[PDB]
Write a protein that binds this DNA or RNA. Structure first.
Ligand SMILES: [Zn+2]
Ligand SMILES: [Zn+2]
Lengths: 248, 114, 209, 285, 49, 240, 193
RNA sequence: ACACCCAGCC
């Protein structure tokens, strides 16, 4: 970690004077490999390379023993058929593997779009608006906007969606205090949405024929099919809610 | 400070006090010799950097080929315009990268710091 | 010192208030947020000798479900607590037939006082707390997750749901700082709620052994 | 981490640092001596005559039958100024530690030479040897201020956004607000947590046994998680969370800290054959 | 050739700066940084340069 | 370890007639907080050859035949006006107060040897022999090489004190000038010395067996030529 | 790879694996001394202005420099540099001192250690006197015609232009990397090679 | 068998 030590009597090599802390004395190779190293810096480079070789040939004998000990610590822990993780003595180590129930080979990196934005930006970009007739007519078809502006149940349902999203935002801010949105989750929703756009030749300019109440109902219905802790009693229901809280 | 031995058995003297006169006596703890102290010191300890390297360097260090030489720091006593400078490398400080200069003239060797 | 000692006493009393509240034991809302100035005004400012005597710091608290279940929180004056002191405090307890209580010790207690604490547990439960260990509310630390002592019926429901035996759950030592904070004996279960970065919340269970 | 205004104002943070750092009588004493002095009035040091004479005018239990063995300490200037103590604090600490048998004499903070005289009161080799013994003990094992284990506490602004305080503003935007933090070179976690003006929430330790014995089992689980992640992701490598979670849960499944060694794995309730395959084969069998 | 000249000039300036720091430390004119010894401060300065 | 600033001298006699013997004069670490342990300072001890536990250095010096401490410190300390080394060697004298003359020091040395035994004179002789033939053989093996050994031990303690005060740097095990290279010559000499000793032992046994039986012995038959030949061959063949 | 392996041990040749660093190879001009008897050195030193250990008061040791021969303290000397110059002259002239005898003056400690035993590793170096090589064109001309002549390496060693320096004496010398590039006249790095 | 070297790949 330090510079070349004073192996001789206050000298790195016999060729330097005593008490020389300059760059050449303590092992600063001012030459490139193309230009060639002078003898002193050649020796110092050899010292550095030898340090590298010693580390390579010594750290194996520590790391192999660390690895073997880690293996034999938990060679028997596995996911049993009630989705719990137990060791050879059937002592539950985790009630669900990784606390969510998901294998590590099918998860991707995703960004939570709710944790970072401020209250004004979050409300602007996540609260459905229906007072503005022009914008809603631009986004939606005539029949759909007529239905949205007519029914009051749909407006209440959309307000409930936004309220639930606000509570979810608060829960996220409790979970992630640092504020990083980079989480690991099973399904890539943005890439799947892009795949849906491309498969069906969705025009991003013309108004769409998707009823927002249909979006609400579809999301709610989907949330009941992603089951990690199946059951009916309150304990299983709470465990299921917790196991997929972040994904939901 | 100051160590000296009794003249009878040539062993280490030790401090002692008497109640009759209340005077320090450096008496030999082995034999039966006593003497009157003249410094009233027992144990002086030096915690911070009081090494005084200026009086510790051997003046013959100037004639070592491996030390640098400079002409910008002439000797104060003999006026020679060449000197040999070096650092300390002593424990108990591990700091103070200062230069100690020794004149290189023969029959000289005044040590000075700067 | 004078101001530092009363500040210490105030912090200890606030921590005891939070401890009792976390146990379901009825304390007034104002006591949970008693300021240093309020404590100084109500109890005293100079414990140098005699105005806030630690005997006056004794706290009575009751249980939410029933007034009958009460406790004491005590504060012996001397650094070292022994058989004769514990005997008189438990005699005072018996005069008011209370079961549970804590003893906040300044330095520690004798091996005899430790033995006398342990042996008579079934008759009256008594807990020890060094005053150093109560200057903070360890349950408020960011590392410590939310502990909740879960009742016998809930434990039975849990073991029925997961089809687990008693000893298959994860363990928590009886001498754990959090376990001592919550005052739990062997056989109880602690529902631990943690935030997770892959699920968002994770509820694990720990059995006291 | 600092809770109140000390997290921003620099000199309050320095006050906290001084209140935490261990400062024994070493590093602040120039040179000590055991000068003999049969009588107090005449003294033996010229520089310590007039203030000695005017201090000993009042017979406040320091003239009756004091031993003639003097201990001159000769405190330093620069080190005392850097550590920010004064004579009265040291005198109070000495009196508290050694009772009234070690009466302390000091001149002022205005003297160019910071002297300090200690004698032995009347109330078993000899007084000189005992005086030397207590001088060494007081130079080594006496605390002027701080915690007995903290060694070289530092201070710096956290440039990286991971360690600095992160908060939500009125509008909810995450603000990367910057505050002073301290990093020690010794663990006395429960003392440091209880100190005045110290955050008892975010104050953590890289040590694992201290977390277990102070905070709890879940606390040490979380701290072990964070420490393993810090080790792995220091070079930019990434490991999925669930593997670290499984390791941390396995070492903390049985209430206490379970080392990944013979002394932690072979002490579980596993079958003898697994243990004998691990290591210490014949002893297990 | 311009790149070689630039590299040589940079190395010459770096060596000159290191000699300047050595001269500053040799006259005890180098104020140590907080939390480090004078030797460690000098080593840190040389390494950074 | 419990020793701080140890010092050693792997002494070996010029002709290497004996294996190398190591003296390990060392200084105790400031770890003891007894009644008068840390106050005086640090004691200096010497782990002499063929003795199973440490000995304070002043006892060895006294055993070499220097009773008065003036003579001791005129060997360990060369400059009178140097209070630091005197203060640092105070504990060594303070520990050796109970030992006051040469013969009692010899008893101190001998009582901790290979065998405790019964009588006094035998282990006085043992201590004299181990200090005459096993402590620093390279400076003296003859009967009256005591002053030279005293000066060398004083130099060793002086080096220890200089290292403790920081006036010298502690040596490096790697400064390749501190390493010697045993080539084919010295290694073969090491085998040949022991194996010639074995041959002479065998000749002695054979000739004793013939002389006690009451007849002259033929020299040629006494020598077992197998020894040197199939010992050198074995060592160069197997490498052991 | 310690610093003192310069010129004695190859910085590159080591096995890779469990024996890295521990197994080394001699440099291409490394020479290991076979040892010599230290008797003539001792006789010369006694004949010179050196005073034995038993003939001196202990008070005189402090100012004088100690003399060690093969690690054995022999006596003391009051003029160190004169003795060092004389000893170096004798070694360079192939006198009673064998060419492989290492001779060391620790000036900062007032010690003179003369090593003669076997096992020391040393290499040849050119001798510099007042910033000039002692190896003149005459030596090169004689060496060029080694055939049909008797000039050889031993004649260089006997001529006092090349001497074997030990790895431990190497601490007390100033080596010039190359003669005509490190001994020229400029703002001199070192003027005492 | 066993032992000891050397060597290869990480
Ligand atoms: Zn005497
Ligand atoms: Zn001069």
């Amino acid at each position: 970690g330090k510079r070349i030590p004073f192996g001789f009597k206050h000298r790195t090599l016999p060729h330097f004077i005593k008490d020389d802390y300059g760059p050449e004395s303590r092992g600063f190779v001012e030459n490139s490999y193309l230009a060639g190293l002078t003898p002193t810096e050649f020796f110092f480079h050899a010292m550095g390379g030898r340090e590298g070789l010693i580390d390579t040939a010594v750290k194996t004998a520590e790391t192999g023993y660390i690895q073997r000990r880690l293996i034999k610590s938990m060679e028997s822990v596995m996911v049993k058929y009630d989705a719990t993780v137990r060791n050879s003595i059937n002592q539950v180590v985790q009630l669900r593997y990784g606390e969510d129930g998901l294998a590590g080979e099918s998860v991707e990196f995703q960004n939570l779009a709710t944790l970072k934005p401020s209250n004004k930006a979050f409300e602007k970009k996540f609260r459905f608006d229906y007072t503005n007739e022009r914008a809603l007519r631009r986004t939606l078809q005539e029949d759909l906007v007529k239905d949205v502006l007519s029914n009051a149940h749909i407006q209440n349902e959309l307000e409930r969606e936004f309220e639930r999203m606000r509570e979810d935002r608060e829960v996220l801010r409790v979970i992630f205090p640092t504020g990083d949105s980079k989480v690991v989750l099973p399904c890539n929703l943005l890439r799947m949405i892009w795949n849906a756009q491309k498969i069906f030749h969705i025009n991003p300019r013309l108004p769409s024929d998707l009823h927002p109440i249909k979006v609400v109902e579809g999301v709610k219905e989907l949330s009941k099919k992603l089951v990690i802790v199946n059951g009916d009693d309150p304990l299983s229901r709470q465990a299921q809610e917790n196991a997929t809280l972040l994904f939901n | 400070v100051g160590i000296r031995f009794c003249q009878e058995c040539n062993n280490m003297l030790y401090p002692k006090e008497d109640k009759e006169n209340r005077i320090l006596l450096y008496a030999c703890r082995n034999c039966d010799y006593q003497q009157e102290a003249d410094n009233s010191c027992i144990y002086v300890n030096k915690i911070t950097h009081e090494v005084d390297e200026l009086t510790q360097i051997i003046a013959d260090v100037s004639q070592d080929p491996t030390l640098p030489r400079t002409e910008d720091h002439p000797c104060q006593k003999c006026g020679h315009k060449e000197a040999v400078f070096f650092q300390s490398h002593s424990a108990r400080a591990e700091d103070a990268m200062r230069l100690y200069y020794v004149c290189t003239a023969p029959h000289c060797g005044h040590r000075w710091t700067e | 010192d004078d101001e530092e000692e009363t500040y210490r006493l105030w912090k200890i009393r606030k921590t005891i208030m939070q401890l009792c509240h976390d146990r379901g034991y009825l304390v007034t809302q104002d006591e949970l947020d008693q300021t240093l100035e309020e404590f100084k005004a109500q109890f005293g400012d100079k414990p140098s000798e005699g105005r806030p005597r630690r005997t006056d710091l004794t706290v009575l608290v009751a249980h939410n479900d029933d007034p009958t279940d009460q406790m004491f929180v005590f504060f012996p004056e001397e650094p070292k607590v022994g058989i004769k002191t514990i005997k008189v405090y438990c005699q005072r307890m018996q005069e008011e037939n209370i079961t549970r209580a804590l003893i906040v010790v300044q330095q520690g207690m004798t091996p005899s006082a430790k033995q006398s604490l342990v042996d008579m547990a079934p008759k009256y439960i008594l807990e020890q707390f060094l005053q150093q260990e109560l200057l903070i509310n360890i349950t408020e630390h960011e590392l410590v997750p939310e502990h909740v002592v879960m009742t016998k019926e809930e434990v039975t429901e849990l073991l029925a749901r997961y089809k687990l035996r008693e000893n298959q759950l994860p363990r928590i030592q009886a001498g754990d700082p959090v376990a001592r904070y919550f005052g739990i004996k062997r056989g109880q279960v602690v529902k631990i709620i943690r935030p997770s970065e892959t699920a968002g919340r994770y509820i694990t269970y720990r059995l006291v052994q | 981490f600092l809770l109140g205004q000390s997290a921003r104002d620099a000199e309050r943070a320095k006050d906290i640092l001084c209140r935490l750092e261990h400062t024994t009588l070493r590093k602040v004493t120039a040179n000590t001596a055991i000068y003999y002095d049969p009588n107090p009035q005449s003294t033996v040091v010229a520089e310590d005559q007039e203030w000695v004479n005017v201090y000993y005018e009042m017979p406040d239990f320091d003239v009756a039958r004091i031993s003639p063995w003097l201990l001159r300490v000769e405190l330093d200037r620069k080190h005392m100024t850097d550590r920010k103590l004064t004579m009265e604090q040291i005198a109070e600490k000495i009196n508290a530690g050694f009772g009234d048998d070690l009466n302390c004499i000091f001149n002022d903070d205005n003297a160019e030479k910071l002297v300090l005289r200690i004698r032995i009161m009347n109330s078993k080799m000899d007084d000189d040897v005992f005086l030397r013994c207590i001088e060494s003990n007081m130079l080594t094992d006496m605390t002027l201020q701080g915690i007995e284990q903290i060694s070289k506490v530092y201070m710096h602004l956290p440039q990286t956004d991971n360690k600095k305080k992160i908060i939500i503003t009125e509008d909810g935007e995450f603000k990367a607000l910057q505050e002073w933090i301290l990093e020690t070179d010794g663990v006395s976690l429960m003392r440091v947590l209880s100190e005045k003006d110290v955050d008892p929430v975010r104050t953590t330790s890289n040590d694992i046994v201290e977390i277990f014995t102070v905070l709890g089992i879940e606390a040490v689980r979380k701290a072990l998680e964070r420490e393993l992640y810090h080790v792995i992701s220091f070079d930019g490598s990434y490991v999925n969370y669930r593997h670290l979670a499984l390791l941390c849960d396995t070492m903390t499944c049985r209430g206490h800290l379970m080392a990944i060694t013979r002394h932690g794995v072979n002490r579980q309730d596993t079958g003898p054959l697994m243990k004998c395959s691990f290591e210490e084969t014949v002893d297990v069998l | 050739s311009k790149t070689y000249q630039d590299i040589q000039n940079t190395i010459k300036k770096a060596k000159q700066d290191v000699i300047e720091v050595i001269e500053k430390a040799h006259n005890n004119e180098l104020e140590p940084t907080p939390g480090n010894t004078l030797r460690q401060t000098f080593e840190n300065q040389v390494n950074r340069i | 370890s419990k020793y701080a600033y140890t010092g050693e001298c792997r002494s070996c006699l010029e002709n290497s007639s004996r294996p190398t013997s190591t003296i390990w004069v060392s200084m105790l670490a400031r770890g003891g907080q007894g009644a008068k342990k840390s106050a005086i300072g640090q004691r200096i001890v010497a782990t002499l050859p063929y003795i199973k536990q440490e000995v304070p250095i002043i006892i060895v010096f006294r055993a070499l035949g220097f009773v008065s401490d003036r003579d001791i410190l005129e060997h360990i300390i060369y400059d009178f006006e140097d209070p630091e080394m005197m203060e640092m060697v105070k504990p060594s004298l303070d520990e050796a107060f109970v030992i006051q003359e040469q013969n009692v020091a010899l008893n101190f040395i001998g009582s901790r040897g290979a065998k405790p035994g019964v009588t006094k004179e035998k282990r006085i002789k043992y201590a004299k022999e181990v200090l005459q033939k096993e402590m620093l053989p390279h400076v003296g093996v003859s009967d009256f090489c005591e002053t030279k050994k005293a000066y060398f031990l004083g130099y060793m303690v002086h080096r220890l004190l200089l290292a403790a005060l920081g006036r010298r740097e502690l040596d490096d095990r790697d400064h390749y000038g501190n390493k010697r290279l045993d080539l084919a010559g010295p290694l073969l000499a090491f085998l040949f010395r022991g194996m010639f000793k074995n041959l002479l032992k065998e000749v002695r046994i054979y000739a004793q067996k013939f002389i006690d039986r009451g007849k002259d012995f033929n020299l040629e038959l006494a020598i077992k030529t197998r020894i040197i030949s199939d010992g050198l061959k074995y060592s160069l063949a197997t490498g052991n | 790879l310690h610093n003192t392996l310069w010129g004695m041990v190859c910085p590159a040749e080591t096995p890779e694996g469990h024996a890295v660093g521990l197994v080394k190879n001699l440099a291409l001009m490394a020479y290991i001394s076979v040892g010599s008897q230290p008797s003539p050195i001792l006789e010369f030193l006694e004949e010179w202005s050196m005073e034995n250990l038993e003939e001196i008061s202990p008070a005189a040791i402090a100012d004088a420099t100690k003399i060690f021969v093969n690690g054995c303290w022999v006596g003391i000397h009051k003029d160190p540099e004169q003795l060092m110059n004389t000893l170096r002259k004798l070694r360079r002239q192939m006198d009673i001192i064998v060419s492989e005898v290492s001779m060391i003056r620790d000036i900062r400690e007032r010690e003179i250690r003369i090593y003669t035993d076997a096992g020391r590793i040393c290499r040849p170096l050119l001798i510099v006197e007042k910033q000039k090589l002692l190896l003149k064109k005459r030596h090169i001309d004689q060496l060029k015609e080694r055939e049909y002549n008797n000039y050889s390496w031993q004649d260089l060693v006997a001529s006092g232009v090349v001497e074997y320096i030990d790895t431990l004496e190497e601490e007390t010398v100033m080596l010039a990397m190359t003669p005509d590039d490190l001994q020229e006249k400029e703002v001199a790095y070192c003027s005492t090679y």
